[PDB]
Design a protein around this ligand. Structure first.
Ligand SMILES: CCCCCCCCCCCCCCCCCC(=O)OC[C@H](COP(=O)(O)OCCN)OC(=O)CCCCCCCCCCCCCCCCC
Ligand SMILES: CCCCCCCCCCCCCCCCCC(=O)OC[C@H](COP(=O)(O)OCCN)OC(=O)CCCCCCCCCCCCCCCCC
Ligand SMILES: CCCCCCCCCCCC(=O)OC[C@H](COP(=O)(O)OCC[N+](C)(C)C)OC(=O)CCCCCCCCCCC
Ligand code: SF4
Ligand code: SF4
Ligand code: SF4
Lengths: 240, 321, 69, 86, 192, 160, 126, 136, 48, 115, 70
């Protein structure tokens, strides 16, 4: 039955010298870096016919495979007990027109058993078929459809591949680097036709390209190496 | 769940930048990470209940959203779209007297949850609409990529706040509710437990908020104070350069996931060494949940599709983006 | 805040002429202490009534009788 | 190499028949932009003075790491292009 | 020595008692048949839910009477834009074009030159209010506090043209709302 | 713990006098607050370098092809050397300057070397490393977590 | 020979995971699956493989736990790979992985090498 | 004042808060109707995409007269954040007539209520039957 | 002093565990009252 | 899960003879469903005109030589067919599809500003 | 819906008894019970046959995964 206190009038402490703990955030991933280097090396040893190379950055491990090796490596990472990556969380692509094969099809897998994440990278072109992992991961059904819709990647074996984001009968694949960000056509309602119609694009205010202020200098340096000593090549000893 | 979305992008950029938020900044993102989680579950649980036919709980809890969005508006100036969580910390510090209002709200919110459970939890009509509806096996939950409450309702005890901790979630205590039957009623109970577990975290953050800077002490990423900007030449240069060129991010890529209220939300960001992201793929938890709807809703009747839609917590801006 | 005792109490303070204006635009008969009047003519009041809820301690009286902007 | 990838790209025919691209090294990367329209590149909006346009490629600037990549990509799309020698 | 010898893991181990116990039968209940049938036929929990609802009927509602009453606002609130002046009447904006570059929606258009008296001043400052996302980046980037957002929200218009603010409109807002702008700046001064 | 708290200890507006006794008589759970914030307590005051250049010391992206991976099984590592010395040392490392298949390397090498570097714990398979080794859970009981009793079809997992 | 073995049950008590039922004969099944795996390894995959070496290392030790323990909880606590119903599924899927690996011939030379510009991002080759 | 339930995006959250107890549009006679036949106000609260525009126009055309349209938020007004997107209509007034424009991202609940009050003010100035007498 | 911080003693603990205590008579009593009311009701119907 | 109606599994055809048969089968399906297109989409033209329009689109890609382009063209032609039959396209899009269609001289273009 | 008609007629058949309960006395009361007891066999029949359920066309059955080992 006591009155409620005025929490505004309760005393507060006073603090002085407070800047930061000066430390490098990359150091806390050191243990993770070594363990993923060993696990990636294990996968390369188990599949020397399919794994081209692997990379470990902080706490992320990437396995680089060919299109004709994706189904095997995904099956190995799905069923092997050491790596029970049962869940495919995301399938996506990135466009690099400078390469012979533009696209980088990326598969992020999750293992709830071992609390681990792994990434699979494979490549593709505008006409090169890519195996579908829908038979392995039914959760890849929509992600592959989205990847095709916005890039145009031929997922062979997909049970139902079609547009999922763009309008019906939409021409073009928006996330390609050569597709303009405003597209080509726009809609409006035509009073004479009594319906909404597509028309070629015209903008009252054209998009302004402030991006030309790209630095004439490079900002970030060459970086600091954090490769585990267990994975660096040994150096020959000096002369006796 | 606005501030959680900003956090996953901020975490990905901070990881690429090789920076880390100071101690007080991490707690603020945890405090409003759980305020945002409550804001989402009020929208999700009560709209799902309203679609089933329980109109009244929607009205009660939306006033709780009004009180929570008042905290959103006081720290940022927008009730909904608060660009408050930014790479390096938060845009502005907590105003004077905010924690007392948050703590005052928390003293009553337990009764609000209990009154909501009075109309739903033990109701025979509510259980008839949710028990045995939208059953998901633990195997099918993993194969279809379900996460969060969809995965946890099927018996799998997995939470990203525990699996890959971030931003002072390691410095608080909370429990995860796990279902056993994987239907709409199990996920309703889990989302009601998370209501109380967030309130448990909110109280701890209010009692453990440390002093210090809220943003990273680096003017090549974070804006300098205005008083320093107008007296220090180097501050004025960094202020000029931040708002006219941004900050460069070292070349690379990352896949950073958080425990969003809908589930696992992740971003796949590719950096080309410039001040613009080369690629940004946003992994939406609702996108994966809706891709399993045909597998889940088969057999059920048309009214059951309404329940299955509402138990997935589908916000289609997240799905489509 | 929804009782008839509060309404009758505020009805006695304002008088019929002022309360009928509140019965036409405000939808609620309310009383308060005059705080000021702006350059447009609106009159701003503050309520000392202990039964008024949080966000209702300040209210305006507009100049018009049928429309309020 | 010689595939007419413009047939399955989805882009309109004017990129192949009308518009001309430029390949240039502006100072470490090779870029591809499009020559402006003779008419319709810009015109002042009569209402608020905005800069209007009907050129949908005006803001598109491809980036390449090598000269070979820029030429190979342009040929693969059937683009009419000229190389601006550095 | 880890669990790697059996391909196991620390995370793979389920806690003690993870397996669900045996489900109960009909004889293994705690309530009698008549006890469960009385709660069933007489709708025990349904009547309780009605009583909880009837309690709310006697509590104070939350409704405020807009527009006679307004919801709370904070000095950080983002609303209608306005250009600001110094106390002498001179415009604060030096046509520096910082806010134009930051603007995530490209809603700001600035054209500048040298004034007749020789000052670095703009002659064209337009904000497309139908394109702005009311995000406050222009306010944060201004080095002279020229561009601000006032707490105003009630400026809905019949036509979309009226949401194309030019410099004269924006300066008129700054004169109109200068006192209210002063409240927000003074209160939010310590945190900026 | 978060057990029940009396209504007067919550920052809401309650009842007084005879009406508080009536409220306690006709409420199923009388300790529940009304939810209306206190006017006199809530919101009464209205709101109105190189040493620390961690970005430029970012980790460098390093890839490991079959060529270098083969070198580690054959020549050892800089932490656990198995390489020769002198001009013989540089002759063996220059072997891995061009394409060297790992499957060919795995064909002719001592399993005592494969089971020490490629595998671990004496031939044990390498298991997917965990993102957080502190992730553990334990079942609890209603007297601990305060949630639904056991008859409800959910369970509560603590930190353990 | 018809060794008809139940991998996943569709009836019985619930295990705590939705859709996963209690296996009525846990220990005899794991022995049969483990032993048929080791025999299937020696018959399909050459001894130079690293997958074959690693699988035999943990298949024997997993089998050596079921052969020397009667308490189901003790077996689970000594392996740490889920329940025994889960352990049976893992053993089944590993057995099916040997058939595919033997078919794939995953131990041989890299089938398709990448192009020179393939794993190069913005000029810095990976 | 019976608007049609047409919440497209984050602008719909503020429209749901108008029906919340704090503002309680129902006290003003405002009820949201699912069917266009029972509605006379169309509140476009959210981004209108090219895939949605024909559906939006069809839904608008099925409202019996008299009908009014409220455009809420920057997306519906002129495109907003997604103005330069390949799949966004740059303003809902390219498809349907708009009677009032409510600004904000999102407009607050009070900003929307003010917009409704402006429309109700214009509706109270209607002279349809005196138009027949004095103009026809 | 310049930042919002918790009080030195901290905030008082709040209620977050479920609080829905059972209320009402035992089901036996409700059934008896139903039979008691039915018996008295038919007695009055019989008298009428 | 199950695929939608009229869905085909994606397969990369490696034989030009087998590809030719698949194209001819699909062309027949377009002709057979032509009367359905007029019914569902309420077109103002006879089904005979619809079949003529279908043939023109197939005649455009008559002389495509590269096999990889054939598969992508075939795959996209199957997706469009599944879109039309299932009535996923809105009627406005199909009406505008038939709205499609002498070039001016040099001076004529010069006078109006050309292109 | 079809079984509604036989039960609707049974309910409508009690109307003569409602307004003549006193006159028929015990004889009519026993006949009234016999009328209801014959119709209660239809109620037992519908319960045991489960004829008042919903005729779904899909059925969810849990297949068992088995391995034909060698
Ligand atoms: C509008 C008009 C009013 C209409 C409403 C009339 C109100 C009266 C309601 C009529 C029902 C009264 C009969 C209630 C007693 C019968 C129920 C009962 O005794 O329980 C069933 C009993 C089994 O025993 P059980 O309850 O399971 O005890 C173990 C619990 N673990 O099974 C038995 O063996 C009991 C058999 C009957 C013996 C008692 C007679
Ligand atoms: C057996 C229940 C006890 C019946 C009580 C009958 C009685 O006491 O008589 C009251 C009334 C008048 O009858 P009367 O001729 O005066 O008998 C002498 C009474 N001193 O008698 C009457 O006229 C009506 C008889 C009473 C009707 C009682 C009905 C009880 C209903 C059974 C319970 C239903 C719920 C199960
Ligand atoms: C008088 C005419 C109007 C009401 C008629 C019907 C009332 C309910 C009868 C069945 C009760 C029952 O079955 O009781 C079962 C339950 C409780 O028993 P338990 O769960 O074992 O309790 C656990 C152990 N205790 C006994 C220690 C608590 O009681 C109730 O939930 C009572 C709820 C009543 C509160 C609301 C009253 C107003 C309702 C609205 C009226 C218009
Ligand atoms: S608030 Fe943001 S979007 Fe609006 S004008 Fe300012 S910078 Fe542009
Ligand atoms: S940032 Fe301020 S001073 Fe610079 S152009 Fe914008 S309004 Fe003017
Ligand atoms: S205007 Fe802003 S708040 Fe409204 S729908 Fe568009 S992005 Fe969301």
């Amino acid at each position: 039955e006591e009155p409620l206190p005025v929490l505004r009038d309760l005393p507060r402490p006073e603090y002085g010298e407070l800047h930061a703990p000066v430390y490098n955030p990359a150091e806390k991933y050191k243990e993770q870096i070594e363990e993923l280097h060993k696990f990636g090396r294990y996968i390369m040893g188990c599949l020397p016919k399919f794994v081209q190379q692997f990379s470990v950055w902080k706490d992320e491990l990437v396995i680089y495979v060919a299109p004709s090796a994706l189904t095997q490596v995904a099956t190995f990472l799905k069923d092997h007990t050491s790596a029970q990556f049962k869940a495919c969380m995301d399938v996506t692509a990135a466009d690099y027109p400078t390469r012979t094969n533009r696209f980088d099809v990326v598969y992020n897998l999750l293992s709830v058993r071992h609390n681990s994440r792994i990434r699979i990278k494979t490549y593709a072109s505008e006409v090169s078929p890519v195996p579908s992992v829908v038979p392995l991961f039914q959760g890849a059904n929509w992600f592959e459809r989205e990847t095709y819709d916005l890039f145009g990647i031929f997922f062979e074996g997909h049970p139902d591949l079609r547009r999922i984001m763009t309008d019906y009968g939409f021409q073009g694949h928006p996330l390609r680097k050569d597709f303009p960000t405003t597209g080509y056509t726009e809609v409006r309602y035509d009073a004479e036709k009594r319906r909404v119609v597509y028309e070629p694009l015209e903008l009252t205010q054209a998009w302004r390209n402030f991006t030309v202020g790209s630095s004439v200098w490079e900002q970030v340096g060459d970086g600091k190496d954090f490769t585990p000593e267990s994975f660096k090549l040994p150096t020959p000893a000096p002369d006796p | 769940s606005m501030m959680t979305n900003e956090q996953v992008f901020s975490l990905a950029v901070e990881k690429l930048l090789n920076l880390e938020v100071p101690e007080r900044g991490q707690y603020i993102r945890t405090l409003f990470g759980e305020i945002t989680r409550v804001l989402n579950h009020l929208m999700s649980v009560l709209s799902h209940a309203m679609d089933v036919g329980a109109l009244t709980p929607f009205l009660w809890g939306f006033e709780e959203r009004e009180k929570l969005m008042e905290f959103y508006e006081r720290v940022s100036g927008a009730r909904l779209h608060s660009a408050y969580v930014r790479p390096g910390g938060v845009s502005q510090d907590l105003p004077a007297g905010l924690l007392d209002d948050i703590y005052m709200w928390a003293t009553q919110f337990g009764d609000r949850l209990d009154e909501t459970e009075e109309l739903l939890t033990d109701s025979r009509i509510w259980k008839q609409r949710t028990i045995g509806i939208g059953e998901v096996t633990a195997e099918d939950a993993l194969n279809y990529g379900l996460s969060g409450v969809m995965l946890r309702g099927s018996g799998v005890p997995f939470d990203i706040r525990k699996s890959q901790p971030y931003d002072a979630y390691d410095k608080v205590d909370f429990d995860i509710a796990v279902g056993t039957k994987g239907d709409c009623y199990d996920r309703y109970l889990i989302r009601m437990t998370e209501f109380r577990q967030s309130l448990r975290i909110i109280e701890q953050c209010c009692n453990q908020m440390p002093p210090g800077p809220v943003k990273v002490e680096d003017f090549k990423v974070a804006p300098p104070p205005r008083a320093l900007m107008k007296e220090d030449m180097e501050a004025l240069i960094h202020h000029f350069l931040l708002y006219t060129k941004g900050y460069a991010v070292p070349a690379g890529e990352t896949y950073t996931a958080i425990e969003a209220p809908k589930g696992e939300m992740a971003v796949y960001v590719v950096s080309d060494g410039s001040e613009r992201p080369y690629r940004c793929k946003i992994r939406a938890p609702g996108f994966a949940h809706l891709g399993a709807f045909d597998h889940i809703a088969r057999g059920h009747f048309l009214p059951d599709a309404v329940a299955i839609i509402g138990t997935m917590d589908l916000v289609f801006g997240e799905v489509d983006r | 805040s929804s009782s008839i005792q509060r309404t009758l109490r505020n009805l006695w303070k304002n008088g019929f002429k002022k309360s009928f204006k509140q019965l036409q635009g405000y939808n609620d008969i309310k009383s308060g202490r005059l705080v000021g009047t702006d350059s447009f003519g609106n009159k701003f009041y503050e309520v000392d009534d202990p039964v008024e809820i949080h966000m209702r301690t300040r209210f305006v009286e507009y100049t018009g009788f049928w429309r309020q902007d | 190499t010689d595939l007419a990838k413009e047939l399955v790209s989805g882009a309109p025919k004017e990129l192949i028949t009308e518009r001309v691209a430029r390949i240039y090294q502006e100072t470490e990367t090779w870029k591809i932009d499009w020559d402006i329209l003779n008419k319709g590149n810009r015109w002042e909006n009569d209402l608020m003075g905005y800069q209007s346009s009907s050129d949908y490629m005006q803001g598109t600037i491809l980036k390449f790491d090598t000269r070979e990549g820029a030429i190979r990509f342009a040929k693969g799309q059937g683009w009419d292009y000229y190389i601006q020698e550095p | 020595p880890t669990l790697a010898l059996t391909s196991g893991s620390i995370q793979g181990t389920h806690p003690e008692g993870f397996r669900l116990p045996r489900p109960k039968t009909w004889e293994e209940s705690s309530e009698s048949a008549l006890s469960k049938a009385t709660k069933w036929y007489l709708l025990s929990e349904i009547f309780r839910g009605l009583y909880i609802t009837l309690e709310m009927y006697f509590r104070a509602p939350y409704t405020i009477y807009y527009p006679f009453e307004k919801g709370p606002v904070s000095p950080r609130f983002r609303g209608e834009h306005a250009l600001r002046r110094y106390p002498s009447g001179e415009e604060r904006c030096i046509a520096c074009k910082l806010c134009e570059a930051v603007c995530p929606a490209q809603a700001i258009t600035i054209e500048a030159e040298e004034r007749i008296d020789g000052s670095r001043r703009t002659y064209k400052y337009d904000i497309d209010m139908t394109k702005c996302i009311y995000c406050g980046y222009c306010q944060e980037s201004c080095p002279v506090d020229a561009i601000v957002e006032t707490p105003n929200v009630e400026y809905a218009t019949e036509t979309r043209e009226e949401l194309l603010y030019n410099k004269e409109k924006l300066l008129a807002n700054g004169d109109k709302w200068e006192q209210e702008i002063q409240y927000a700046l003074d209160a939010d001064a310590p945190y900026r | 713990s978060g057990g029940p708290v009396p209504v007067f200890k919550k920052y809401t507006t309650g009842s007084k006098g005879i009406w508080e006794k009536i409220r306690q008589l006709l409420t199923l759970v009388p300790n529940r607050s009304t939810g209306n914030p206190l006017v006199k307590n809530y919101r009464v005051p209205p709101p109105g370098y190189y040493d620390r250049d961690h970005r430029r010391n970012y980790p460098r992206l390093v890839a490991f092809d079959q060529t270098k991976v083969s070198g580690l099984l054959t020549l050892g590592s800089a932490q656990n050397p198995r390489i020769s010395v002198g001009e013989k040392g540089q002759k063996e490392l220059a072997v891995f300057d061009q394409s060297v298949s790992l499957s060919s390397t795995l064909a002719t090498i001592d399993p005592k070397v494969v089971k020490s570097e490629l595998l671990a714990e004496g031939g044990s398979p390498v298991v997917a490393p965990s993102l957080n080794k502190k992730m553990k859970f334990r079942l609890t009981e209603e007297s601990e977590h305060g949630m639904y009793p056991e008859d409800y079809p959910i369970r509560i997992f603590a930190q353990n | 020979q018809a060794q008809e073995i139940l991998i996943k049950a569709n009836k019985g008590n619930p295990t705590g995971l939705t859709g996963l039922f209690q296996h009525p004969s846990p220990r005899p099944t794991l022995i049969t699956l483990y032993k048929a795996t080791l025999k299937n390894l020696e018959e399909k995959i050459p001894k130079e493989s690293v997958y074959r070496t690693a699988v035999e290392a943990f298949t024997k030790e997993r089998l050596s736990i079921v052969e020397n323990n009667e308490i189901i909880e003790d077996i689970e606590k000594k392996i740490g790979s889920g329940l025994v119903e889960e352990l049976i599924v893992q053993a089944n899927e590993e057995y099916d992985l040997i058939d595919k690996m033997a078919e794939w011939k995953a131990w041989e030379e890299l089938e398709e090498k990448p192009l020179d510009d393939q794993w190069t991002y913005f000029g810095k080759k990976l | 004042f019976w608007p049609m339930t047409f919440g497209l995006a984050c602008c719909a959250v503020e429209m749901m808060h108008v029906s919340a107890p704090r503002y309680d549009q129902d006290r003003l006679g405002i009820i949201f109707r699912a069917s266009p036949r029972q509605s006379d106000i169309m509140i476009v609260a959210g981004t209108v995409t090219n895939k949605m525009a024909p559906a939006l126009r069809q839904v608008y055309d099925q409202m019996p007269y008299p009908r009014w349209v409220i455009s809420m938020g920057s997306c519906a007004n002129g495109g907003g954040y997604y103005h330069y997107s390949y799949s966004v209509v740059r303003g809902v007034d390219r498809i349907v007539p708009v009677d009032i424009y409510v600004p904000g991202c999102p407009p607050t609940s009070e900003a929307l209520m003010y917009g409704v009050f402006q429309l109700q003010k214009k509706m109270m100035d209607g002279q349809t039957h005196r138009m027949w007498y004095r103009s026809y | 002093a310049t930042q919002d911080l918790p009080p030195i003693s901290g905030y008082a603990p709040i209620q977050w565990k479920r609080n829905l205590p059972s209320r009402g008579f035992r089901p036996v009593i409700w059934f008896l009252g139903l039979c008691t009311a039915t018996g008295y009701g038919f007695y009055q119907i019989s008298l009428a | 899960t199950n695929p939608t109606a009229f869905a085909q599994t994606t397969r990369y055809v490696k034989d030009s003879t087998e590809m030719r048969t698949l194209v001819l089968n699909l062309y027949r399906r377009y002709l057979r469903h032509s009367r359905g297109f007029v019914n569902n989409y309420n077109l103002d033209i006879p089904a005979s005109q619809v079949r003529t329009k279908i043939r023109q689109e197939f005649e455009r890609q008559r002389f495509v030589k590269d096999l990889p382009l054939k598969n992508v063209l075939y795959m996209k032609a199957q997706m469009e067919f599944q879109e039309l039959v299932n009535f996923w396209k809105q009627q406005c899009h199909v009406m505008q599809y038939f709205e499609s269609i002498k070039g001016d001289s040099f001076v004529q273009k010069f006078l109006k500003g050309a292109q | 819906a079809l079984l509604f008609l036989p039960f609707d007629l049974e309910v409508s058949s009690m109307l003569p008894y409602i307004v003549s309960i006193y006159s028929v006395g015990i004889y009519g009361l026993i006949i009234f019970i016999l009328f209801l007891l014959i119709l209660i066999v239809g109620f037992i029949y519908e319960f045991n046959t489960k004829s008042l359920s919903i005729t779904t066309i899909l059925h969810k059955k849990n297949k068992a995964l088995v391995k034909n080992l060698y």
